[PDB]
Design an enzyme around this catalytic site. Structure first.
Site, short mmCIF file in Angstrom:
data_model
loop_
_atom_site.label_atom_id
_atom_site.label_comp_id
_atom_site.label_asym_id
_atom_site.label_seq_id
_atom_site.Cartn_x
_atom_site.Cartn_y
_atom_site.Cartn_z
N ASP A 7 54.22 45.70 53.84
CA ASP A 7 53.53 46.88 54.33
C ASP A 7 52.16 46.35 54.76
O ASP A 7 51.33 46.03 53.91
CB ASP A 7 53.38 47.90 53.20
N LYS A 68 43.88 46.93 62.09
CA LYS A 68 45.06 47.67 62.50
C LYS A 68 44.70 48.70 63.57
O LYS A 68 45.53 49.05 64.41
CB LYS A 68 45.72 48.36 61.29
N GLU A 172 57.01 53.06 59.25
CA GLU A 172 56.63 53.30 57.87
C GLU A 172 57.38 54.47 57.22
O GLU A 172 57.90 54.32 56.12
CB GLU A 172 55.11 53.44 57.77
N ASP A 196 52.21 61.22 54.30
CA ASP A 196 51.49 59.97 54.07
C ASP A 196 49.97 60.13 54.17
O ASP A 196 49.43 60.34 55.26
CB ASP A 196 51.98 58.93 55.08
N1 LIG Z 1 44.98 57.18 41.47
C1 LIG Z 1 44.58 57.45 42.71
N2 LIG Z 1 44.01 58.63 42.99
C2 LIG Z 1 43.52 58.84 44.18
N3 LIG Z 1 43.50 58.02 45.23
C3 LIG Z 1 44.06 56.84 44.92
C4 LIG Z 1 44.62 56.49 43.72
N4 LIG Z 1 45.10 55.17 43.77
C5 LIG Z 1 44.82 54.78 45.01
N5 LIG Z 1 44.18 55.75 45.74
C6 LIG Z 1 43.65 55.72 47.13
O1 LIG Z 1 44.65 55.31 48.09
C7 LIG Z 1 43.97 54.79 49.24
C8 LIG Z 1 44.77 53.58 49.58
O2 LIG Z 1 45.97 54.07 50.03
P1 LIG Z 1 47.09 53.19 50.55
O3 LIG Z 1 48.22 54.06 50.94
O4 LIG Z 1 47.31 52.10 49.57
O5 LIG Z 1 46.54 52.68 51.93
P2 LIG Z 1 46.89 52.72 53.49
O6 LIG Z 1 46.40 54.03 53.94
O7 LIG Z 1 46.01 51.60 53.92
O8 LIG Z 1 48.30 52.47 53.81
C9 LIG Z 1 42.47 54.53 48.84
O9 LIG Z 1 41.73 55.58 49.53
C10 LIG Z 1 42.52 54.67 47.27
O10 LIG Z 1 41.31 55.25 46.75
MG LIG Z 2 50.03 53.09 54.43
#
Ligand SMILES: Nc1ncnc2c1ncn2[C@@H]1O[C@H](COP(=O)(O)OP(=O)(O)O)[C@@H](O)[C@H]1O
Ligand SMILES: [Mg+2]
Length: 378
Positions: A7, A68, A172, A196
């Site tokens: 990913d 990205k 995705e 998402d």
């Molecule tokens: N327990 C949680 N509660 C709230 N937000 C979270 C938690 N764990 C991770 N995040 C948030 O998820 C985001 C990362 O998301 P992710 O889906 O991994 O990324 P992407 O959008 O890059 O695909 C960050 O904004 C992080 O703060």
């Molecule tokens: Mg993502």
């Protein structure tokens, strides 16, 4: 070496591998299951992942992220023009193509967005290799459903230059569905809604699956809404508090702000399980230690409008796809932000109590599905 699932995210990337009928989400050197999509250049080295993000406050102009958002795009692109107005690093034109310009070891160097991403890709690749104890060659990399052929190409290229034989580029949302097994043939049409909400992007996708074939009937969201916006709200809130308490405005001191943000994002994660978290920062401004805390209630209150607005893209997706709430069979949560209680309640209330798929860590779902797809493809 087993084919892996990667990913390649906007703010966080994740790698998983299918083995013995089980998918394993591989943790990094620091023990995290997702690694920031950050690359930093210094006098002495090139830092990728956590090491990179852990110093962005110190080396802002030479720390690259959001690659990205550039990948497979042109410099003249309105997206690029709007975007670069917020990045602390340089983006230059090069025969139409955009390039990020950094200073590595005293000398000025520029990189094509696909090269930056290949750096992140190499990092995931060695994370896999460290775990597997063998060379990883084949891989399935994921891309948003809205990516055109150029963007897909560039993502494929980032893979090749990273030494990865990209078996396939899959959307995705489709990877998320496969993770939950929603791709198995049940002799009937199935509508799945992928919600998402990640670090900086928000995407809603309605997939129609029949005979095992996917059909993205509709998509919606916001490319500029994610967990970072929730952090900003906490920041603005605490900046005002420090002011009342110490009649000092720390706004101008980029370092004070950047350190406060890091504390907020962490408090945010804690808020998804606890009703409050303490913010303990030593010498934030001058020599004043910022010790305080927030409650989940106050947190929800600071982001109320943002959370609520999350439903508008959901309604749009529905009407475009020509479906009513009643017709969507499964709802799968993707993205780290979906771990927020209020977001789960809000979405459930909208779907009149319907059960939400969320047994697989939302920020690991895409990786999980890609690993499964990689496994079948090899
Ligand atoms: N327990 C949680 N509660 C709230 N937000 C979270 C938690 N764990 C991770 N995040 C948030 O998820 C985001 C990362 O998301 P992710 O889906 O991994 O990324 P992407 O959008 O890059 O695909 C960050 O904004 C992080 O703060
Ligand atoms: Mg993502």
């Amino acid at each position: 070496g087993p084919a892996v699932g990667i990913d390649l995210g906007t703010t966080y990337s994740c790698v998983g591998v299918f083995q013995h009928g089980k998918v394993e989400i591989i943790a990094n050197d620091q023990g995290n299951r997702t690694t920031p999509s950050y690359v930093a250049f210094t006098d002495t080295e090139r830092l990728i992942g956590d090491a990179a993000k852990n110093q962005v406050a110190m080396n802002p102009t030479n720390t690259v992220f959001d690659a990205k958002r550039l990948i497979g795009r042109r410099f003249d692109d309105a997206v690029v023009q709007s975007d670069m107005k917020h990045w602390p690093f340089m983006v230059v034109n090069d025969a139409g193509r955009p390039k990020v310009q950094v200073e590595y070891k005293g000398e000025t160097k520029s990189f094509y967005p696909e090269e930056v991403s290949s750096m992140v890709l190499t990092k995931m690749k060695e994370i896999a290799e460290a775990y597997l104890g063998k060379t990883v060659t084949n891989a399935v990399v994921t891309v948003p459903a809205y990516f055109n052929d150029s963007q897909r190409q560039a993502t494929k290229d980032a893979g090749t230059i990273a030494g990865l034989n990209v078996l396939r580029i899959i959307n995705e949302p489709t990877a998320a569905a496969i993770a939950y097994g929603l791709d198995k043939k049940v002799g009937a049409e199935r509508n799945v809604l992928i919600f998402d909400l990640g670090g900086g992007t928000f995407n809603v996708s309605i997939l129609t699956i029949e005979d095992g074939i996917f059909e993205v009937k509709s998509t919606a969201g916001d490319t500029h809404l994610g967990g970072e916006d929730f952090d900003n709200r906490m920041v603005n809130h605490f900046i005002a508090e420090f002011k009342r308490k110490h009649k000092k405005d720390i706004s101008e001191n980029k370092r004070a702000v950047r350190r406060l943000r890091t504390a907020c994002e962490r408090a945010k994660r804690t808020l998804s399980s606890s009703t409050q978290a303490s913010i303990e920062i030593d010498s934030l401004y001058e020599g004043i230690d910022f010790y305080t805390s927030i409650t989940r209630a106050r947190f929800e209150e600071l982001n109320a409008d943002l959370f609520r607005g999350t439903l508008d893209p959901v309604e749009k997706a529905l009407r475009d796809a020509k479906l009513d709430k009643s017709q969507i069979h499964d709802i799968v949560l993707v993205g780290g932000s979906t771990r927020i209680p209020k977001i789960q309640k809000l979405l459930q209330d909208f779907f009149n109590g319907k059960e939400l798929n969320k047994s697989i860590n939302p920020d690991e779902a895409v990786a999980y599905g890609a690993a499964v797809q990689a496994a079948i493809l090899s």
